[PDB]
Design a protein around this ligand. Structure first.
Ligand SMILES: [Zn+2]
Ligand SMILES: [Zn+2]
Ligand SMILES: [Zn+2]
Lengths: 696, 1155, 80
């Protein structure tokens, strides 16, 4: 009777562990009562038997679930305990019928394992279909819904229940694409309500949190297939579909107030959506283009311009260093956007740069904060169309610094030459140092003048300059006291008799000298102009002279004279005193030499007139550069027509504009063409208005 | 090419400037492409030819040659590029000066065109020559030009030449002792780039050398360069100078002490880039070591010592927020405001240093930090009377910006101070001395004042204010004109005060304020920002100054009409007209509504969205206040444009439009002949929609309530019921929406008797009639009977109560709603029936109590108070475990009754608590849980006293009491911690106890052959652990973190369900307090070892594996967080573990998984 | 008994090539009075000679040195 006693020796063991009631026999005896029961033929009605009672117990569990209490939080903890129990009572039947699996069902591929069946009955009789399933998915979704606001769930309850759906293959199906469906309508409401309910800084605070929650909920209890398609729903709802509306109401603000905080956040987020980074790039350009076109288009901001332009470039660097995590796309957006606005104002921005550095090298000592200034000025200079405007203005302002008073630092000038001849030119500098060569070839012919004449028997240091390289000055006669017109000629007839066969043309505007002053309570000296010195010298022959009798004995035109006597007298109340006193001077005005000598330091400099740019000279030094351009055009066409004999008109306008930076609108270019046609340097023909020919 | 390059190289020396120029230039475009054809002969001729032209008599050929070498290197031989450098490097030594400039400039050009492979060989040859060139053998600008390239190299390719780092350093150290001050400053910049791209060993060699030489003191001319060096390193390196500083700061204090204009100035700015770059150093020394030196002017080089001291304070205030509250406000403003005059540049940095202090005082988003500032106000005002009349443009600008920030931070603070400020504003405003840049700030400031103050404070001053402001509006420059108009816009709101009545003279200025604006509105030929500001302003002038305005008004209104048609200004004029129409000074608009409404209706389809919402909101307030101008044509223009607006796509656009129609319905009942097409049809496109919000819903109920009252054709009562229900009489989510909608129609027009009747026989006829129909039928009864008195046809009660026993549980749950909601409409009648029914038969006990919840949850508080004691008596009787929900439904009514009035009931529960049962004690503590609200509620002060009385005597009881007691503590610590933060001392001892495994509660209840052990005290432990997670967000202020991390250990080796919860406690702890964690990081990693290594027995199942494998990856997920810790992480066991995880394949296949 | 004495003096003079009464070394008209291919501005070169631009542009065709020096001709200024 070994046949049908074992068939229900285990039917009292499986019926024992399903009701937790202990029997006599153990895992060492029952395991050996089935190992010697299962042969290679009778085991067909054993898996058929095991199923037979596994249905009869699980199918009795569903009648337990259908009761009164509707509240999910209780019902879910019930399914849970039913799955925790079932699952943890099968994994004891598998260890009893261990020899059933090793042999029979391992070799029956069509028939599922002992455990596989166990679940197969659970997805068919307890979850499967009808109230239990759909109210579990309803319960699971309700906890999830409550977790999305203040309410706290049982995080572990959701873990086993979703794991259960993972172990029953119903997850892929009855949950994921109905969870997402519900998640998509939740962030749609938020994405629209919160956008019109708060400010960008505070909305981005929220979206970062929200995203943190989902990517955190993804780990704790959700299944791992759903990552890609969940997170890309929230991004598509809180960031996607709102990008333009954020930079609409937020970006102009966030930039002005310079919130490196909320900017950094905006970038991290706008990285996560496809069209993101490029849309910020778009808007960032047209902010710079905008803020800059306000800094440089209006002349009412010339006073500051460059200074505020520097402050801006630094702010825009700081943001693309820390907020924009040094993105090369953006530096390239801005570099290009900076050039676009800097040049929307013809020539003035190039000029106000030259006048900035001129003032930043004048009569400040900390070169640690001065080299860093020139650095960030250079950093702005590279964007200019028409770098020639800066060339001359700096060249003529170098003249001021080189001949009329000394520079702030001795090395700082040669440091600025060095800092120049890159992104500037090698010929743009050979004219800049052609002056420096004149400075040191003069002070070399000075020693040969000084080391001869003193034994043969007013201290004099002449700087002899080449008229071609230097800002062509206007001459003016000056009635110099007959003793220095002696030293003028003890040197003129020294020069022409060394440097051979030349002319010399003395300048009064660039002459300056030192005077010993003797009055009351102060022997102080005065550095003064060649005009200041003659006006002050004639006070050694009595006191006071009308505007008439000065103009006679000094010999100045009213254009400069009215300016010089403006200084010394009423100008900050210095050394002279006008009888009909005011701001300006008129025909019958007298000037007494003021006998009270106020100044505290020694060696006073009243040489201010010679430091300032006259609008006579300013509006004129711009004008000379415009004229200078349409001559380099000639130097250009001749060079290209020389190399390649034939060329197109659309291939000649495309060559000269490539060869020089400055504007040159094609309307200017057609004038200069036929100032060479009508002079026979090049020839039109091949019966078209589109091709030219050389002929030397 | 082969012969064409054999051609160019002849043209390149044809004795003509033009010849050589174009030859090079053509070669320079060929080398900048991919470069076709350069044989190994070209390389030895072309590069031989380029080098020549670096010495040409023409400089433009020199320019092209120099700018040629760069785009030549990235297209030629490895050996050839080396050959070039050797030429330029020898040319550094030089003969003629012309060569020394062009070769140095060439070397820079080459240095750029280096990307990592070949670039090393390039730089190594250079670096070897530059080091020998930096050598001291006396040369002015051969040392300089070499130092110049040296820096330009380490900034780009300083990452290479790692084995050349200690070569450079030991040749730059003895150059700081150079005769020329120039060299010293040039070497600093060179060292600047080195300290960055090098590693420790050579950084330390510098810092020590620098320090020991400072200790040597030796030479004064050097000691100042030797401090300048410690400075530039702080800028470049930043956090690298972090460690070696406790040794540094003392020596630099001993030097800013020493008498010297120079050095003292160089120490304060070095002191700056310590508290500016390394917030680690925390020293108040620097503050005081500035306060003394912030005023060193005896009675000229002295000035710079102050400016540097001011900068530092500004950069010390800009970082520290804990140094503001008490400290700063007493010690700095007393000196900053004091030193508010001087020389312009120091003044500017001093000013700036108060702005930073005012920046820092901003809202976070005894005494508050701002009350000190409130006290400081009078001294600042006094100081700024002197300053605002200054010659300088820049000084006065810092004055206005000072106020502008002040008024924004502490608004109203400039009230008792106005009259001594205005003359200062008016000055800078109109006198020629200013710039565009300045008066635009003076205007902005004026605006910012006008807004944040009582319009009263300005009344006696409108005399001197109007004249120049009005003159500014007429300024040429556009940026001023707009800002002047934006001030003028508020000036009108200062004569207006139509919030609170105030007698003030208005008429004298309406002449001048008006004309100046229209002159800017009638322009149409200036900047568009002015054009808009003119409209934004004139809106406010018409809105307020109407009753004193001449016959200009109706004609100017026509100008608003013509600015409306404009593609640019429209939106601005739309909301400018929104504010006019809604002004209490009921002003005419009849002459421009005629054509205005269509032109407005038109905007609706412009999809600007912003314009959509703006025009809708104007259409609402234009139809309201002028409901006598409207023609039938006007309306039909608006209505045939609305259908796209009503759609689930955009709730807010829709709900604005719906509530516009609600306005229409109530004010022109004639007009609605029209909504029967598309509009209505799409309005059900929002009801059925599964996203209809409670806001937009009630925005629609009012619409229906106002639509069937008008009695318009097609849209009757019994008509609209079938437009709502028809859909649901055929076969997701909100059927509810269709009920509380159909309810609003009933209470509107009462042909209700029968309408309710057909609905009952629709539940009785559950034969043929589906749940989809029986469901909506019930919910609608509840929503109707909520306001109407439904105690009529008993085809009610006993029919609702039939659905209590329906196959569909959906129906039962909404049948419960129906009963509860119906009873509210006649409480005296139903409430003593429902109370009676609960005891009557348990056969329906649960669902009935859930109707009682909805009776508590909706009744008039006036009409429910009479029955309050009765309900309470019924609920007390029912804590029967007939089900478990039965209790939790009662333990929620009781709760919601406590919300209703707490004074009498809150201590009444504490009464039953004193000595209840095993289930009655469970009911009292959970009732007080549903009292805890998210945002503060008018019950919680009386709660904040009683929650002590509950919890304290709730941790000591037994069974499923502690589970609830700990959940009620959790909820309090999570939802509103200000109930618990001041109770944690007495409670935490009880809590941590419930974290240890109760040995008595483990019981053996084995099934059969296999043996099994269950833990009863699991859920009281699993709940206690979820408190330690909760207390880590708000309550770490009141915690012993060390004693806390003891219990983190228990649950690091506890039950699988708990291990999870504590693994997430670690990841939070290793961020929220990295300090205490690292101290115990020993006995936190070995419990994580156990959880990782233990392999599952290979015979077990699909789940048994993955359930432990998802466990394994929450331990690693937790190790990773302990790794990102203030770097001392390599402790004994942790360094062992890093080699253990890189050895195992599977244990690496878990670290791989997540990051 | 003098209040003012001349201590230092920094004179300034511009050296230029003196040729037959400033006359252009080609068209020999003047230097500020038009030329041949005109019957118009001064054109300074690297070498430092005064020329009418028209006449100096002519001499880049046949040769490239300067009609007075022998250095290769460049350009240094456009205006007297
Ligand atoms: Zn001539
Ligand atoms: Zn001419
Ligand atoms: Zn010559």
């Amino acid at each position: 009777n070994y046949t049908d006693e074992t068939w229900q020796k285990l039917k009292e063991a499986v019926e024992a562990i399903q009701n937790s009631t202990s029997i006599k026999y153990n895992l060492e005896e029952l395991y050996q009562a089935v190992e010697n029961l299962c042969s290679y033929k009778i085991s067909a009605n054993l898996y058929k038997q095991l199923r037979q009672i596994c249905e009869d117990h699980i199918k009795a569990q569903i009648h337990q679930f259908r009761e009164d209490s509707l509240d999910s939080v209780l019902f879910l903890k019930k399914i849970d305990r039913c799955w925790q129990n079932h699952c943890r009572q099968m994994i004891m039947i598998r260890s009893i019928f261990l020899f059933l699996d090793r042999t029979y069902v391992l070799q029956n591929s069509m028939l599922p394992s002992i455990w596989d069946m166990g679940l197969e009955l659970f997805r068919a009789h307890i979850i499967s279909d009808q109230k239990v399933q759909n109210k579990t998915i309803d319960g699971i979704l309700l906890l999830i819904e409550r977790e999305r606001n203040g309410e706290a769930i049982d995080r572990s309850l959701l873990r086993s229940l979703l794991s259960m759906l993972s172990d029953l293959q119903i997850y892929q199906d009855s949950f994921e694409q109905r969870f997402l469906e519900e998640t998509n309508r939740l962030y749609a409401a938020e994405g629209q309500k919160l956008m019109q309910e708060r400010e960008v800084p505070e909305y981005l605070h929220h979206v970062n949190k929200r995203l943190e929650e989902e990517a955190d909920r993804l780990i704790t209890y959700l299944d791992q297939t759903t990552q890609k398609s969940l997170i890309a729903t929230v991004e598509k709802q809180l960031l996607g579909e709102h990008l333009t509306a954020i930079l609409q109401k937020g970006l102009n603000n966030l930039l002005d107030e310079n919130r490196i905080q909320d900017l950094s956040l905006l970038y991290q987020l706008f990285s996560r959506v496809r069209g993101g980074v490029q849309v910020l790039l778009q808007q960032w350009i047209e902010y710079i283009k905008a803020f800059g076109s306000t800094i440089v288009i209006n002349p009412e901001k010339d006073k500051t311009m460059v200074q505020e332009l520097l402050d801006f470039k630094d702010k825009v660097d700081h943001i693309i260093d820390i907020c924009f995590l040094k993105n090369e796309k953006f530096i390239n957006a801005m570099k290009e956007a900076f050039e676009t606005f800097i040049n929307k104002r013809p020539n003035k921005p190039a000029e106000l740069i030259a006048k900035y550095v001129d003032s930043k090298l004048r009569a400040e000592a900390t070169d640690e904060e001065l080299e860093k200034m020139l650095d960030k000025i250079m950093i702005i200079f590279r964007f200019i169309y028409g770098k020639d405007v800066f060339e001359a203005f700096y060249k003529k302002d170098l003249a001021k610094r080189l001949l009329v008073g000394k520079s702030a630092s001795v090395d700082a000038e040669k440091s600025m030459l060095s800092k120049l001849k890159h992104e500037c030119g090698a010929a743009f500098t050979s004219k800049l140092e052609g002056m420096f060569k004149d400075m040191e070839l003069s002070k070399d012919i000075m020693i040969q003048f000084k080391q001869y004449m003193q034994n043969q028997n007013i201290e004099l240091t002449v700087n002899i300059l080449t008229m071609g390289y230097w800002p062509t000055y206007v001459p003016m006669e000056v009635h110099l006291p007959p003793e220095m017109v002696k030293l003028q000629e003890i040197f003129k007839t020294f020069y022409l008799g060394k440097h051979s066969g030349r002319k010399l043309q003395w300048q009064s505007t660039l002459g300056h000298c030192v005077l010993k002053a003797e009055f009351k309570e102060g022997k102080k000296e005065l550095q003064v102009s060649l005009f200041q010195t003659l006006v002050l010298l004639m006070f050694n022959e009595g006191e006071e002279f009308s505007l008439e009798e000065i103009k006679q004995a000094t010999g100045i035109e009213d254009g400069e004279l009215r300016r010089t006597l403006q200084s010394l007298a009423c100008g900050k109340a210095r050394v002279l005193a006008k009888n009909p006193k005011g701001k300006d001077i008129e025909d019958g005005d007298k000037f007494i030499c003021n006998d009270d000598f106020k100044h505290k330091l020694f060696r006073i400099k009243i040489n201010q007139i010679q430091m300032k740019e006259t609008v006579e000279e300013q509006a004129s030094t711009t004008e000379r550069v415009f004229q200078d351009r349409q001559y380099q055009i000639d130097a250009a066409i001749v060079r290209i027509m020389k190399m390649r004999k034939t060329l197109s008109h659309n291939l000649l306008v495309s060559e000269v504009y490539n060869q020089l930076k400055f504007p040159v609108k094609p309307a200017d270019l057609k004038k200069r063409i036929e100032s060479l046609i009508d002079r026979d340097y090049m020839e039109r023909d091949k019966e078209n208005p589109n091709q030219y020919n050389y002929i030397a | 090419a082969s012969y064409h390059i054999s051609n160019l190289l002849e043209k390149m020396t044809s004795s003509d400037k033009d010849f050589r120029f174009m030859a090079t230039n053509d070669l320079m475009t060929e080398l900048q492409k991919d470069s076709i054809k350069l044989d190994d002969d070209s390389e030895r001729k072309v590069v031989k030819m380029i080098l020549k032209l670096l010495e040409d008599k023409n400089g433009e050929v020199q320019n092209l040659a120099v700018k040629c070498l760069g785009p030549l290197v990235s297209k030629v031989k490895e050996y050839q590029v080396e050959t070039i450098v050797d030429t330029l490097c020898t040319n550094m030594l030089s003969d003629k000066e012309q060569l020394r400039d062009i070769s140095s400039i060439g070397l820079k050009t080459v240095i750029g065109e280096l990307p990592s492979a070949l670039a090393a060989n390039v730089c190594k040859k250079i670096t070897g020559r530059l080091t020998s060139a930096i050598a001291k053998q006396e040369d002015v600008s051969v040392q300089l030009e070499a130092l110049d390239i040296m820096a330009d190299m380490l900034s780009r390719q300083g990452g290479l030449l790692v084995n050349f780092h200690p070569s450079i350093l030991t040749c730059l150290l003895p150059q700081l002792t150079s005769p020329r001050l120039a060299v010293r400053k040039r070497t600093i910049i060179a060292l600047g780039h080195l300290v960055m791209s090098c590693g420790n060993i050579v950084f330390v060699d510098l810092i020590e050398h620098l320090l020991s030489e400072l200790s040597k003191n030796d030479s004064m001319s050097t000691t100042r360069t030797y401090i300048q060096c410690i400075a530039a390193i702080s800028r470049q390196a930043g956090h690298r100078i972090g460690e070696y500083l406790e040794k540094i700061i003392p020596l630099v204090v001993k030097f800013c002490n020493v008498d010297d204009d120079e050095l003292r100035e160089y120490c304060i700015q070095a002191f700056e880039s310590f508290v500016r770059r390394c917030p680690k150093e925390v020293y108040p020394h620097v503050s005081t070591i500035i306060n003394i030196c912030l005023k060193y002017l005896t009675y000229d080089m002295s000035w710079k010592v102050r400016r540097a001291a001011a900068k530092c304070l500004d950069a010390v205030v800009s970082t520290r927020h804990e140094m503001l509250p008490e400290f700063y406000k007493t010690v700095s403003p007393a000196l900053i405001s004091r030193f508010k005059e001087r020389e312009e540049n120091v003044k500017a940095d001093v000013f700036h240093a108060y702005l930073s202090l005012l920046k820092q005082t901003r809202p976070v988003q005894g005494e508050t930090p701002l009350t000190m500032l409130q006290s400081q106000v009078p001294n600042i005002v006094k100081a700024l009377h002197k300053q605002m009349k200054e010659k300088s443009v820049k000084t006065r600008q810092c004055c206005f910006n000072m106020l502008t920030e002040l008024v924004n931070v502490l608004p109203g603070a400039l009230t008792q101070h106005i009259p001594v400020l205005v003359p200062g504003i008016i000055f800078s405003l109109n006198d020629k001395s200013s710039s565009s840049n300045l008066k635009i700030d003076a205007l902005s400031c004026l605006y910012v004042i006008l807004c944040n103050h009582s319009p009263q404070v300005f009344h006696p001053h409108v005399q001197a204010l109007v004249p120049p402001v009005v003159a500014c509006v007429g300024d040429p420059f556009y940026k001023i004109t707009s800002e002047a108009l934006l001030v003028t816009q508020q000036l009108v709101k200062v004569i207006r005060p139509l919030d609170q009545p105030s007698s003030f003279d208005a008429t004298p200025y309406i002449k001048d304020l008006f004309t100046c604006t229209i002159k800017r509105l009638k322009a149409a030929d200036i900047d568009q920002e002015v054009k808009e500001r003119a409209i934004s302003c004139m809106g406010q002038i018409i809105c307020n100054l109407g009753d004193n305005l001449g016959s200009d008004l109706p004609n100017t209104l026509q100008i608003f009409l013509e600015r409306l048609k404009n593609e640019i200004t429209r939106l601005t004029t739309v909301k400018a007209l929104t504010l006019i129409a809604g002004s209490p000074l009921k002003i005419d608009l009849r002459p421009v509504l005629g054509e205005g409404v269509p032109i407005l209706a038109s905007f609706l389809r412009k999809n600007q969205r912003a314009l959509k919402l703006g025009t809708l909101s104007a259409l609402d307030i234009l139809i309201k206040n002028y409901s006598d101008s409207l023609t039938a044509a006007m309306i039909d223009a608006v209505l045939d444009e609305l259908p796209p607006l009503i759609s689930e796509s955009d709730m807010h656009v829709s709900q604005m439009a719906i509530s516009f129609l609600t306005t229409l319905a109530k004010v022109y009942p004639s007009s609605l002949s029209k909504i029967s097409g598309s509009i209505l049809n799409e309005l059900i496109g929002l009801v059925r929609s599964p996203l209809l919000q409670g806001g937009a819903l009630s925005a629609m109920l009012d619409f229906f309530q106002a639509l069937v009252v008008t009695g318009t054709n097609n849209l009757g009562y019994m008509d609209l019921l079938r437009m709502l229900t028809g859909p649901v009489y055929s076969q997701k989510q909100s059927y509810y929406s269709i009920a509380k909608c159909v309810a609003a129609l009933t209470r509107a027009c009462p042909k209700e008797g029968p309408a309710v009747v057909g609905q009952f026989i629709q539940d009785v006829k559950n034969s043929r009639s589906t749940d989809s129909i029986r469901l909506l039928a019930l919910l609608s009864l509840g929503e109707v009977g909520h306001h109407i008195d439904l105690s009529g046809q008993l085809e009610l009660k006993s029919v609702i109560l039939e659905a209590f026993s329906s196959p569909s549980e959906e129906v039962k749950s909404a049948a419960s709603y129906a009963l509860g909601s119906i009873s509210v409409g006649n409480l005296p009648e139903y409430l003593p029936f429902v109370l009676q029914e609960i005891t009557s038969q348990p056969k329906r006990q649960y669902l009935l109590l859930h109707s009682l919840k909805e009776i508590i949850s909706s009744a008039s508080v006036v009409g429910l108070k009479p029955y309050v004691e009765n309900i309470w008596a019924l609920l007390l009787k029912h804590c029967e475990c007939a089900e478990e929900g039965t209790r939790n439904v009662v333990v929620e009514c009781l709760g919601k009754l406590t919300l209703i009035d707490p004074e009498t009931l809150l201590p009444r529960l504490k009464g039953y608590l004193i000595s209840g049962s095993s289930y009655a004690r469970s009911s009292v503590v959970t009732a007080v849980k549903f009292t805890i609200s998210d945002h503060p509620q008018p019950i919680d002060p009386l709660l904040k006293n009683c929650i002590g009385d509950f919890l304290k005597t709730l941790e000591d009881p037994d069974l499923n009491v502690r589970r609830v007691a700990l959940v009620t503590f959790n909820s309090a610590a999570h939802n509103k911690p200000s109930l618990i933060r001041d109770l944690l001392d007495t409670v935490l001892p009880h809590l941590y106890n419930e974290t240890k495994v109760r040995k008595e509660l483990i019981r053996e209840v084995e099934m059969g052959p296999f043996k099994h052990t269950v833990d009863d005290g699991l859920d009281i432990r699993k709940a206690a652990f979820e408190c330690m997670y909760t207390l880590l967000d708000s309550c770490l202020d009141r915690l012993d973190i060390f004693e806390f991390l003891n219990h983190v250990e228990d649950g690091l080796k506890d039950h699988y369900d708990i291990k999870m919860l504590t693994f997430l406690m670690l990841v939070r702890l290793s961020t929220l307090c990295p300090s205490a964690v690292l101290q115990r990081l020993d006995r936190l990693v070995e419990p994580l070892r156990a959880t990782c290594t233990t392999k599952v027995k290979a015979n077990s199942v699909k789940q048994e594996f993955e359930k432990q494998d998802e466990l394994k990856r929450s331990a690693m997920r937790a190790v990773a967080a302990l790794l990102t810790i203030p770097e001392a992480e390599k402790s004994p066991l942790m360094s062992e573990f890093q080699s253990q995880i890189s050895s195992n394949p599977e244990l690496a296949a878990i670290f791989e998984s997540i990051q | 008994k003098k209040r003012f004495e001349v201590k230092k003096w920094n004179a300034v003079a511009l050296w230029a090539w003196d040729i037959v009464v400033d006359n252009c070394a080609i068209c020999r008209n003047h230097i500020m009075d038009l030329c041949i291919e005109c019957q118009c501005t001064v054109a300074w070169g690297v070498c430092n000679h005064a020329f009418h631009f028209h006449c100096i542009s002519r001499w880049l065709k046949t040769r490239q040195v300067c009609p007075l020096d022998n250095r290769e001709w460049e350009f240094q200024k456009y205006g007297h």
